[PDB]
Design a protein around this ligand. Structure first.
Ligand code: ATP
Ligand code: MG
Ligand code: MG
Lengths: 337, 20
C-alpha cells in the first residue's frame, strides 16, 4: 500500500538526489510573457517554450542577491530536491540552467492562481473545502518526511490551484534533506513554530505546526497569530494561546489544539503513531485518503480558464528587465546548480 | 470582531519569507 509506495518512492528519489539533472535548457529557448509572482528571493514568469509551444513558470534568481541574502546553500537545496521529487501535489521541475547573472528553474505552469488570492477574496473556506486542501498537504508531508525532507515554508502564497482544483506545492526554497536537528531561522512569520522563533534545534514537527496554521487560516479567513509587524507576531506565537471562531466545529478545534501544540511530546505528526494521528482524527473521518491521492475526489472549485497562457487568476506585477552581464558572477558558489 | 481587526491590519497582502 502506502508502505510499498513510499519504499519505491524513496528508491526513485535517491537515484535523482545522487545524480542531479543539470543544465537542461537555455534562456533563449523561452519567450518571456508576464510576471506571475514574486517573493523575497525570486521572480516567477510565465514563459512559452519556443520549440513545443508549451507554457511554463520560470523562477529567476539573481545570483548576487542570493549571496547577499545568505541563501546560497538553500538555493542549491531547492533545485537539488525539487528535481528529485515526484508526487501528485508537488509542482514538477521541467528544466533548470544558469547564465552569467541568474539561476533559472522552469516549472510546470499552475494556472489557477495562489490559494492566497482565492482565500482572501472569498473570505474563508468552508470546513469541507479546507479539509480537501488539508488532506493533500498531509499526504505531501508524509511523502516529503519519508525522504528525510523538511519543507519549511507552508503558506497559501506557496500553494497553487491547478486546472482540476487540486493543490500544487511550489517554493522549495527552504526545503532541506536532514536526518537530525536543524537550526536555520527561516519560514514566513505567521507560520513559524515556537521552537524556530526561540532558536532551538528543530525538526519536521515544524511542518505539522505550519499545517495547523494553514488549516486555521483557511477555515477562519485570518491566521491564528497576526499583528502589524513580525516581532509582535512572534510574541503571540510563543504565548501560544489560540482563540477559535465560533463557527469552528468541535472536531476542527480539537485537531488544531493538537497541531498548534507547543509541547513536542504532544504535537500530532511528531508522535509514535506518526501521520496516522492526523489521518485518523475525527475531523478527517470523511476523507478517503486513497481517493485524494488518486485525484478522484471532485474538487470544491475549478479555476476559470480562458486559454493556455491566460494569467487572470494572478495579480499583476511591475515587470523588470532580465539583464545578463558579460561577466560570470558567483561561478564557484553555484557550480553544482 | 477579529475579522475586522485582521482586515484593518498591515499584513493582509501577500507575505514573503524571512531570513537571517
Ligand atoms: N509553478 C508555478 N506556477 C505558477 N505560479 C508560480 C509557480 N511557482 C511560483 N509561482 C508564483 O510565483 C510566486 C513566487 O515564487 P516563490 O514562492 O518560489 O518565490 P520566493 O522568492 O521563494 O518566495 P518566498 O518569499 O515565499 O520565499 C509564488 O508565490 C506564486 O505566486
Ligand atoms: Mg514563496
Ligand atoms: Mg521561497
Amino acid at each position: 500500500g502506502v508502505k510499498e509506495f513510499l519504499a519505491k518512492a524513496k528508491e526513485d528519489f535517491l537515484k535523482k538526489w545522487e545524480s542531479p539533472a543539470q543544465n537542461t535548457a537555455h534562456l533563449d529557448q523561452f519567450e518571456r510573457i508576464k510576471t506571475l509572482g514574486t517573493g523575497s528571493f525570486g521572480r516567477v514568469m510565465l514563459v512559452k517554450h519556443k520549440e513545443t509551444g508549451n507554457h511554463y513558470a520560470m523562477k529567476i534568481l539573481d545570483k548576487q542577491k542570493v549571496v547577499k541574502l545568505k541563501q546560497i546553500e538553500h538555493t542549491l537545496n531547492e533545485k537539488r530536491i525539487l528535481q528529485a521529487v515526484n508526487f501528485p501535489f508537488l509542482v514538477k521541475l521541467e528544466f533548470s540552467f544558469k547564465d552569467n547573472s541568474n539561476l533559472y528553474m522552469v516549472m510546470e505552469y499552475v494556472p489557477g492562481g495562489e490559494m492566497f488570492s482565492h482565500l482572501r477574496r472569498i473570505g474563508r473556506f468552508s470546513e469541507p473545502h479546507a479539509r480537501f486542501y488539508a488532506a493533500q498537504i498531509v499526504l505531501t508531508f508524509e511523502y516529503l518526511h519519508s525522504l528525510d525532507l523538511i519543507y519549511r515554508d507552508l503558506k497559501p502564497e506557496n500553494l497553487l490551484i491547478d486546472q482540476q482544483g487540486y493543490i500544487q506545492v511550489t517554493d522549495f526554497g527552504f526545503a532541506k534533506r536532514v536526518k537530525g536537528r536543524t537550526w536555520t531561522l527561516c519560514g514566513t512569520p505567521e507560520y513559524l513554530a515556537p521552537e524556530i522563533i526561540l532558536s532551538k534545534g528543530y525538526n519536521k514537527a515544524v511542518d505539522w505546526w505550519a499545517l495547523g496554521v494553514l488549516i486555521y487560516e483557511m477555515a477562519a479567513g485570518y491566521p491564528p497569530f497576526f499583528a502589524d509587524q513580525p516581532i509582535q507576531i512572534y510574541e503571540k506565537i510563543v504565548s501560544g494561546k489560540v482563540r477559535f471562531p465560533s463557527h469552528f466545529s468541535s472536531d476542527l478545534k480539537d485537531l488544531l489544539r493538537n497541531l498548534l501544540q507547543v509541547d513536542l511530546t504532544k504535537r500530532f505528526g511528531n508522535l509514535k503513531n506518526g501521520v496516522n494521528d492526523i489521518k485518523n482524527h475525527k475531523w478527517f473521518a470523511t476523507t478517503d485518503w486513497i481517493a485524494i491521492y488518486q485525484r478522484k475526489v471532485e474538487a470544491p472549485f475549478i479555476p476559470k480558464f480562458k486559454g493556455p497562457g491566460d494569467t487572470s487568476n494572478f495579480d499583476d506585477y511591475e515587470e523588470e528587465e532580465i539583464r545578463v552581464s558579460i561577466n560570470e558572477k558567483c561561478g564557484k558558489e553555484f557550480s553544482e546548480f | 470582531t477579529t475579522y475586522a481587526d485582521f482586515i484593518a491590519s498591515g499584513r493582509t497582502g501577500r507575505r514573503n519569507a524571512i531570513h537571517d
